[PDB]
């Protein structure tokens, strides 16, 4: 007569449990090795061998309880083996876990992935790109942020009324002009998580697709990148239905069905980018799958004179303006990136960008 | 009660244990064959029959404590069993292991390859070619190598204000010019490692692509041979999206997201290399993916030059300026590695070169 709690593979709190049980790797006779390497020079690699607790039957000392926790072998079922009929230990067991686990995810983002028809962590929590370190057009980042606050503050509005609670938003623009950098940039401000999804997978169809978007995280964004290169459309359209052209068993219908339709969830922020505006098929951005969309386009004298004034602070105003008539005058259309590089040409360098402006 | 390290094949130092176990194979009762052969004449070819030890359960005599080693057997596993509890000679092996592999990776360069989703060693280690034996442009080398050591050296500016840690660099020009030649004269320079990369094999997908790229080994670089073949574009792009043209599951947004993304590592440098530059993708090339771009092209003055007075070594000067003067006079465009070839023609033989230039 004892306890057997079981958590396979399919939990949230899974990643916790393995955090606490690599923390809790003492007194295990059977390991793994967790071994990491930091070169330096001179073929001087530093050495971190520690011990992951390998898939076996370990036997900890929780609270003294010789608590037996068994990992099978690609399905995965942990085992919580216990004595008696207690279940106090496990509210414990399962709040360290999420202490720790916490702990860790501080200041960082947390990607996820799309690995069968569920989400996985996809590598260790990536540092959080400060806000103002993207420059957009004047007035832009604000309103977007206004909008998904008053989304977020605002859920008894939309029940009393009884309009779907859901949103999401369109960037479109030249390359290179800080779509990705902006939504990384919002997702470390609003302390949300990344999910990752490729609408051009070969193991992605319309009951994979609708599970997955009903199952992903809470406090999490879901990123649909190049929607354009899944459905050629619009000259297609005025002959034939909208074909695929793309690797896996997806349909327009579909699609259009999962991102608004009758089974769709609810409290759900979806962000989308393109290149080609004017190669979506009208129905896909009608409003109710797509609430907001904004245009990043090219550099202007504000944004310019601002990405100078960010990259050599402590300058002087006028060196600023400077630079932005002198690139204005040089060249008509520029994009962000190319001003990024110039700039990394010059490293530390500030009146020296200031004369070289030879980039036609 | 015993210690059982378990070290599976998707490690780093599993190569670093191989070469210490056949260092080790001595008192190991079951062998495997380990005969290399080195013919020199008259059918009399040099046996080096030596003991690699056999996947088994081979008894090991390290510091006098009694190891159990064990290899496995697709699925390869190593098991390093031992006595108590001490942990200390596991440190000792691995270190030796360090020790016994660095110092046979001296002078040479290590070539990975893409083996499934992860990198695996191609053979023995390849004796660099040296940096100057490679002749380009006037002051070309110079600036790609200054423009490395300086974006390996300063890791905090990047930091310090949001950009992410990357670079990338791409090589063009007629074939025959010395693009791979230089890398190789780079990596052995650089004391770096290759990474071999094709993006037409048939067991890549993005996820795989990216996987790859978060996982490469730590003071390496990447190359990416023939981008250009690996995706049809230009006229193409004027009418229907990018299509992949190859044997493959892979797309050209998924390569695009996995080169600069959101969920991309950092650390990293990335080579490329094609023969049409007209045949790229404008999004391919911007900056940000392809920092640095250069053009090796066919021979000049001073390159002709400076390959006459190192093929033949200890020459009056004039005698080069004179093959210099008659190449050019003689055809416009000529490559570098036909001038190798007919300097391979004639061995050892100066002022002979200089009379037989006709080549047209
Ligand atoms: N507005 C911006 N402010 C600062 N850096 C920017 C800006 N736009 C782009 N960059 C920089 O340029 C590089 C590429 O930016 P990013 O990937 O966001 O561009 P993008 O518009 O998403 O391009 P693509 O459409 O090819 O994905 C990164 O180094 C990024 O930091
Ligand atoms: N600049 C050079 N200096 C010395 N040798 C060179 C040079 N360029 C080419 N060679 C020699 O010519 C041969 C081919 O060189 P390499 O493979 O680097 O050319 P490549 O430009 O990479 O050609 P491809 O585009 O076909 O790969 C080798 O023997 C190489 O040593
Ligand atoms: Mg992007
Ligand atoms: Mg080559």
Redo the contacts with the bound molecule.
Sequence with gaps: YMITLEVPARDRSYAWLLSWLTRHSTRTQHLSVETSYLQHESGRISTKFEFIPSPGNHFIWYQGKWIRVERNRPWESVTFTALGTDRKVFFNILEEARALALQQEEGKTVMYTAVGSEWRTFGYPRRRRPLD????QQGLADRIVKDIREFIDNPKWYIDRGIPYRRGYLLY??????????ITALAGELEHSICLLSLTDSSLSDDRLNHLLSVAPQQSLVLLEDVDAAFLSRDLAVENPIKYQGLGRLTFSGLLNALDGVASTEARIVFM?T?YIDRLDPALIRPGRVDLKEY?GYCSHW?LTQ?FQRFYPGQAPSLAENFAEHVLKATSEI???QV?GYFMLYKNDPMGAVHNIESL
């Design positions: 370190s993207v420059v957009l623009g030249p390359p290179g002009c800080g779509k990705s950098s902006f980018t290149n990043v944004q990405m994009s962000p990136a990024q």
